[PDB]
Design a binder for this molecule. Sequence first.
Ligand SMILES: CC(C)=CCC/C(C)=C\CC/C(C)=C\CC/C(C)=C\CC/C(C)=C\CC/C(C)=C\CC/C(C)=C\CC/C(C)=C\COP(=O)(O)OP(=O)(O)O
Length: 373
Amino acid sequence: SEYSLSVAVLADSEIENVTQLTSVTAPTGTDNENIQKLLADIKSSQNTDLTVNQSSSYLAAYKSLIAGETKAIVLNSVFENIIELEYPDYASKIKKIYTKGFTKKVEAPKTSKNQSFNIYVSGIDTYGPISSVSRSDVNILMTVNRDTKKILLTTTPADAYVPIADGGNNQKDKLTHAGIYGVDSSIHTLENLYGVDINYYVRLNFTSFLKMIDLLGGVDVHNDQEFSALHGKFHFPVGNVHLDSEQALGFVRERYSLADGDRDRGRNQQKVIVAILQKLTSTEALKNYSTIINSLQDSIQTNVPLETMINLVNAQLESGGNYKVNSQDLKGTGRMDLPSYAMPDSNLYVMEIDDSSLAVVKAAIQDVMEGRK
Ligand SMILES: CC(C)=CCC/C(C)=C\CC/C(C)=C\CC/C(C)=C\CC/C(C)=C\CC/C(C)=C\CC/C(C)=C\CC/C(C)=C\COP(=O)(O)OP(=O)(O)O
């Protein structure tokens, strides 16, 4: 993966280059490794020593820059998308006078040592190309036991107030924000929360979802409550419903009008996962899995190795047999009085986790993995 650290000044600054500076403001408390590599690079290429004025975060550095309290900041490009949350026009306010590119070797998928594995499904709140950055409003863990032919779907509410890994600095914030830092942040956040290994991920957005449902010929679900979606464009009666791509997207997005609100939306997403799995495990879909990869690979990101896909597909082609699917959701209490790490100046709704629910959720994941009752 690729990111950059830059030295940024205000767009209209007289400063043109780093040799004109004596100090820079940077969050060395939380991004010190990266910051020190940038400073060493500046020393190497420009023979310029800079002292650091410590900021509490990249957001804090940005605030100091626009307040005119510092002349220059360090900016790590990952954190641009976080700054954008409180300051949507930040890009127009700054210029970059020095740039250093970075690469982080990707954390490999973990092959499970037994019959079970966990796949994390991240759904990103945007249309367009898959590289588009946004929050992850779908966060479903699929625990699959190939020996017992059981799958457990664990939904964690987008607003769940949890320690956010990596860029989140292990500070509490809504889970959906982890997806802005990147899929690694989402994965490690949920690994930490549930005490489990996540073997693989799949990341997709609105446009990805539409393409996938299109390719599979729609999906079929049993709808439990009458509702409408997308400012009344679609109406879903009680009973068996076929969903084409646009209908399915409406079906998984509506929450406010549902009897159990976001929990019912989570359940509707689980129904749609089951229906997708039913299409994906048809003899035709399995035989044609390579065409499905070819058709969706530009819009769906995953670290499931090709090798593993071939094993999963062919084992299913040989054996048949459907997976029994069960579902659960992490519960808690909605509050508007708890601080957001990413958006410290905003009052956001978050869901404070219920400890007893967390214990139950963890025990159910372990039971399915171990092939227990
Ligand atoms: C068959 C095979 C491959 C193998 C054999 C089977 C086997 C042995 C195992 C199975 C496992 C494997 C390896 C593969 C199968 C593929 C799997 C596991 C899953 C497929 C399902 C999938 C990839 C996605 C479904 C995700 C889903 C339900 C929804 C995504 C919708 C999106 C992107 C966003 C919605 C965001 C929301 C809720 C609100 C924003 O919207 P809002 O309007 O509120 O906000 P605003 O827009 O206004 O801001």
